[PDB]
Design a protein around this nucleic acid. Structure first.
Ligand SMILES: [Mg+2]
Ligand SMILES: [Mg+2]
Ligand SMILES: [Mg+2]
Ligand SMILES: [Mg+2]
Ligand SMILES: [Mg+2]
Ligand SMILES: [Mg+2]
Ligand SMILES: [Mg+2]
Ligand SMILES: [Mg+2]
Ligand SMILES: [Mg+2]
Ligand SMILES: [Mg+2]
Ligand SMILES: [Mg+2]
Ligand SMILES: [Mg+2]
Ligand SMILES: [Mg+2]
Ligand SMILES: [Mg+2]
Ligand SMILES: [Mg+2]
Ligand SMILES: [Mg+2]
Ligand SMILES: [Mg+2]
Ligand SMILES: [Mg+2]
Ligand SMILES: [Zn+2]
Lengths: 49, 49, 134, 142, 36, 258, 181
RNA sequence: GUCGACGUACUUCAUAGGAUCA
RNA sequence: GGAUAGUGGCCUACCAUGGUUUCAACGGGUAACGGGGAAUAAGGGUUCGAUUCCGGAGAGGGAGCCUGAGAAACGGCUACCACAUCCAAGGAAGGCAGCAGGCGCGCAAAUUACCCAAUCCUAAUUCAGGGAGGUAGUGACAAUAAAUAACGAUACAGUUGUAAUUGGAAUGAGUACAAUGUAAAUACCUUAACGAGGAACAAUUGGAGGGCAAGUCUGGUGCCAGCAGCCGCGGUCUCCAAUAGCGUAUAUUGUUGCAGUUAAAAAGCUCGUAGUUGAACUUUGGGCCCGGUU
């Protein structure tokens, strides 16, 4: 029963989809900049100063 | 929602978070799937790069 | 004689007689054949998901009337149209067309009530403890 | 109001219990093969001192040979005898007069009318026989 | 925001501790018995 | 399974070991040895759970590797060596000698013995047969093969084995009026005198045993062990002398001694 | 995995929670003995039912039956030790005559009230839960503690308690320090 | 096709009687 | 006779025609692993048992094997079927129904944690290894105990009720020296020092019943009645039940012992196989002895 939902149309293209937008939101000084730096280093092995 | 994943970051070393949980966060994002939303599937939008 | 065997070696006739006659019970027949859920309002489930087609009593003049609290809902499992209760017209504001509603058993003829809308408890929304995610 | 009653709770009826036997109670014990003494000890988990009055006894003697079994069971030495100081030989009136007078007795009966009229009186545990054994109605200690 | 108690009916303080509520009820019952 | 098992869950372990059911998940599996699995007491349980000398398995291993424990006059080093009925456990450093005997409750009991009585053991003759080169030999209940037995020794007799030489010193025939010890069944640990042996060809023989209190009980012949003549046991018996006592009498005695 | 650890329920809902007489009796018991909720009354009723059912079953057996003698003697001994059953009433018949109020009487809250340490049953409960009462040399903070006949005479204020000879509590020394300043 | 039969599931109609009083 | 570790149609060759079955064979269904057990019941019975122990089978599905005492093994190998990874396109490598952790949806739920300190297991072996196992973390699974106030004074109101009145005594939730605890930690039990008047250190889940207006709707034998009333001219409330737990939805045949004229059900009648059942009779009585109970 929980598998059922309202039918909807997803327009995401079948090939070459756009990059997913990730918004890092938080109060000032919480560590948004460092989290982005920590992630990008992992995925790409390079640090953005 | 109940049971929502909540990640924990301890401290910052060299302007970077500990490697282990960044791996957990990175994997979690990779396998993520996104719902079809009414507004985003009915209008064209672009974030300026 | 009561019309039934009583001999000390007549155990088999009694058992075979009993097994044959047990199928007469409607409860027994439903239980073994797995047909006890046709009569269930949701076809065996405790809750039913639906799509809010329209708020029928939205135009009724008298406030908080029985008609005002009724909504016509499409059961997603089978597409049959049914009617559901909302606890009060104040809760009716939360319910609008084309959202998922979880229905549970309850103007005669209306046998369902809305318990969750958009995956959130209707009671919680009424108590101002959550927001309906859209 | 009796001092033995706290609102609708009778704070005097404690084990061992005193129980009045109605005439019809005996048959329904017999029809169900329920021993009188053990049946009560089982329903209430207490020692019960059965009591049978003259009027009910007079009723039993009147019944005739058909109910001889109830009679001899009634005359069992474990069953104590209650003297009656009123002319009328009716049993239902006699019993309710007793429970009204002193609040210590359990009424054992199955008559709907008597059961209803006992129910009106507060602090009177009502006992009956049904199904397979005895049942106690208004007794919190159970 | 923190507790998110929302809208709830006003409840007497006695409900917070059952023992006190039962104490008060029993005392009231004794007073009413003194009338009976 | 695809081969022999090597683990033993605590719940599946023999009851008479008296193991805590919540201390762990596994129990000592007795290694292969003189006695059967279910009728043996591994040295770990004896040193730790009965004598309380060792607090945990590692200390038991430390004891054994020091070569202080002797079973039947031979040093053993296996923690799970299956010591059992009529086996002599010598701890020289403590100057202690023990013989494993079931108490009335059916459990191995810590019975202290003198050195002289420790010099020998008793064995039930399980088999008498001619070996290679026409040499008769006897196999006892503990798996000892002794060559050149006395010809009168037959199955179900008892042989007094001297541990130093592993030879038969004397023997007792299984006959009416002999003192016997029960080593199996619900009557485990009781002592009595034979009254009569019922024989059933192709079946299990039954033996009637009368206790000192004149109570009688019947037991399968496999569970009987002749230990001497009435009033003259060849070994020292544990406390209670194998007399079964009712629960009420046990209560009375316990209250009295307390 | 590790072998199971047994567990059990110490109370059961009555056959008829909604009887008015039962409600009144629960009210009376709770007020008299200062019980927090109906769960305590249900618990004690469950225990008393268990003992009385056992007494019935033992009575059913023939007299001199060894099981009857042994189990009846053990049950009577336990009931006499805990103080519910008096010395002169050592018969299974009088075991069957017990009532809930007897068990509520032995509770450490009621005993603390009766011996004079507290002005109310509620005051006794507060004292118990605040670590002021000691049975023997030991502090007990559980109102439902069932006091034995031997232990009834050793109830006292705990040595560490301010009422038992220890230093004043935080409030007292705080106020004294403020006054001194 | 607002088709027939059967199976299944539900709805519905049949409850007042004696005594006293005005 | 072959093969097997061995008995055996297990297989081969020649022989006979046998074997089971209305006392239910054979075939079909099984949301069928079996048992110890669990629930209910007064007793008979009825249902559940993947799931802490025992036994059996499997490692995506069939088939077949080396090694070795022990395997038709799969965290050993080989093919085929289906999936699926790397690739320089020539080739190579696969099996989580082990522990963590993902997908199966677009709607969801334990940590990709620490340790071999206890349990025992493996080895050439006291020492190495062990996601077996233990330790802690994490949705109120199921269970035990048990806080959220106690004692006074004053005031107000019709000897009762009400306090954002008031007095100084007590205490743990929490914080924290320390020590204990542990493989190392956390926690528990301890305990210096802090930690209470709205004790705001702010208990919940359901049900029942009111009352109010220059307010709103509807109907009529005037002023009324029903529905109901967060909305009015301006202006930015009471009680009941449980209680650290509470609510909602679905689900939940008679052996003992049923009935068959008139309201379920006696077959149109008879014969008849299986099944069930089937008259009475065979050493009774008498006279002594012994030792047991109450
Ligand atoms: Mg920034
Ligand atoms: Mg007849
Ligand atoms: Mg044989
Ligand atoms: Mg203290
Ligand atoms: Mg299956
Ligand atoms: Mg099953
Ligand atoms: Mg199973
Ligand atoms: Mg296998
Ligand atoms: Mg799989
Ligand atoms: Mg395989
Ligand atoms: Mg494997
Ligand atoms: Mg695997
Ligand atoms: Mg897994
Ligand atoms: Mg696990
Ligand atoms: Mg070597
Ligand atoms: Mg904590
Ligand atoms: Mg025939
Ligand atoms: Mg005959
Ligand atoms: Zn009379």
């Amino acid at each position: 029963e929980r598998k059922l939902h309202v039918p909807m149309v997803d327009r995401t293209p079948e090939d070459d989809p756009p990059p997913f937008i990730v918004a890092v939101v938080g109060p000032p000084g919480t560590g948004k900049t460092t989290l982005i730096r920590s992630l990008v280093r992992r995925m790409t092995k390079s640090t953005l100063n | 929602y109940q049971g929502a994943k909540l990640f924990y970051l301890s401290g910052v070393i060299n302007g970077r978070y500990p490697d282990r949980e960044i791996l957990n966060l990175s994997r979690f994002i990779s396998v993520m799937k996104f719902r079809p939303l009414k507004w985003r599937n009915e209008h064209p939008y672009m974030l300026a790069d | 004689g009561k019309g039934k065997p009583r001999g000390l070696n007549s155990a088999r006739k009694l058992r075979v007689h009993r097994r044959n006659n047990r199928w007469a019970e409607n409860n027994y027949k439903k239980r073994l054949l797995g047909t006890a859920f046709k009569s269930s309002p949701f076809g065996g489930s405790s809750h039913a998901k639906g799509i809010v087609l329209e708020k029928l009593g939205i135009e009724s003049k008298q406030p908080n009337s029985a008609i005002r609290k009724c909504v016509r809902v499409q059961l997603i499992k089978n597409g049959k149209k049914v009617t559901a209760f909302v606890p009060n017209d104040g809760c009716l504001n939360f319910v609008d067309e084309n959202d998922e509603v979880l229905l549970a058993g309850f103007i005669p003829g209306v046998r369902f009530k809305v318990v969750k809308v958009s995956g959130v408890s209707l009671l919680a929304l009424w108590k101002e403890k959550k927001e309906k995610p859209r | 109001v009796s001092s033995a009653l706290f609102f609708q709770y009778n704070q005097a009826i404690k084990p061992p219990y005193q129980v009045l036997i109605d005439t019809n109670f005996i048959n329904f014990s017999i029809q169900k093969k329920v021993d009188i003494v053990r049946g009560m000890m089982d329903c209430l988990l207490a020692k019960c001192n059965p009591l049978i009055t003259d009027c009910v006894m007079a009723e039993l003697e009147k019944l005739g040979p058909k109910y001889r079994i109830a009679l001899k069971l009634a005359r069992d030495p474990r069953i104590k005898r209650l003297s009656c100081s009123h002319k009328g030989t009716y049993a239902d009136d006699c019993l309710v007069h007793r429970v009204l007078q002193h609040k210590c007795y359990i009424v054992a009966t199955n008559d709907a009318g008597l059961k209803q009229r006992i129910r009106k009186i507060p602090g009177i545990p009502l006992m009956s026989v049904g199904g397979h054994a005895y049942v106690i109605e208004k007794l919190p200690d159970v | 925001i923190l507790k998110n108690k929302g809208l709830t009916p006003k409840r007497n303080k006695d409900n917070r501790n059952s023992r006190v509520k039962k104490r008060k009820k029993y005392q009231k019952a004794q007073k009413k018995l003194k009338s009976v | 399974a695809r081969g022999p098992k090597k683990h033993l869950k605590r719940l599946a372990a023999p009851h008479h070991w008296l193991l805590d059911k919540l201390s762990g998940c596994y129990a000592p599996r007795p290694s292969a040895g003189p006695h059967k699995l279910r009728e043996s007491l591994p040295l770990i349980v004896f040193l730790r759970n009965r004598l309380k000398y060792a607090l945990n398995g590692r200390e038991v291993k430390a004891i054994l590797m020091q070569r202080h424990v002797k079973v039947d006059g031979k040093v053993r080093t296996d923690t799970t060596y299956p010591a059992g009925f009529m086996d002599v456990i010598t701890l020289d450093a403590t100057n202690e000698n023990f013989r494993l005997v079931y108490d009335v409750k059916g459990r191995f009991a810590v019975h202290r013995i003198t050195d002289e009585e420790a010099s020998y053991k008793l064995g039930k003759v399980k088999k008498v047969q001619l070996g290679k080169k026409g040499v008769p030999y006897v196999v006892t209940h503990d798996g000892r093969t002794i060559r050149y037995p006395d010809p009168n020794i037959k199955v179900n007799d008892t042989v007094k084995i001297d541990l130093a030489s592993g030879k038969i010193t004397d023997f007792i025939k299984f006959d009416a009026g002999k003192l016997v010890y029960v080593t199996g069944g619900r009557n485990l640990g009781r002592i009595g005198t034979i009254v009569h042996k019922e024989r059933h060809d192709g079946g299990f023989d039954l033996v009637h045993i009368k206790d000192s209190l004149d109570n009688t009980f019947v037991t399968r012949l496999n569970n009987v062990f002749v230990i001497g003549e009435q009033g003259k046991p060849y070994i020292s018996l544990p406390k209670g002398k194998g007399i079964k006592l009712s629960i009420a009498e046990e209560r009375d005695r316990r209250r009295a001694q307390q | 995995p590790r072998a199971p650890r047994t567990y059990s329920k110490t109370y059961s809902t009555p056959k008829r929670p909604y009887e008015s007489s039962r409600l009144d009796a629960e009210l009376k018991l709770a007020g008299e003995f200062g019980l927090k909720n109906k769960k305590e009354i249900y618990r004690i009723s469950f225990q008393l039912s268990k003992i009385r059912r056992a007494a019935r079953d033992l009575l059913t057996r023939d007299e001199k039956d060894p099981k009857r003698l042994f189990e009846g003697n053990a049950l009577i001994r336990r009931l006499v030790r805990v103080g519910v059953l008096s010395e002169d009433k050592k018969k299974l018949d009088y075991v069957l005559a017990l009532k809930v109020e007897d068990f509520l009487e032995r509770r450490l809250q009621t005993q603390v009230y009766k011996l004079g340490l507290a002005k109310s049953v509620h005051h006794a409960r507060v004292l118990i839960t605040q670590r002021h009462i000691a049975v023997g040399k030991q502090i007990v903070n559980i109102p439902s503690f069932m006091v034995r006949l031997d232990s009834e005479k050793h109830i006292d204020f705990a040595p560490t308690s301010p009422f038992g000879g220890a230093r004043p509590g935080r409030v007292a020394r705080r106020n004294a320090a403020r006054k001194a300043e």
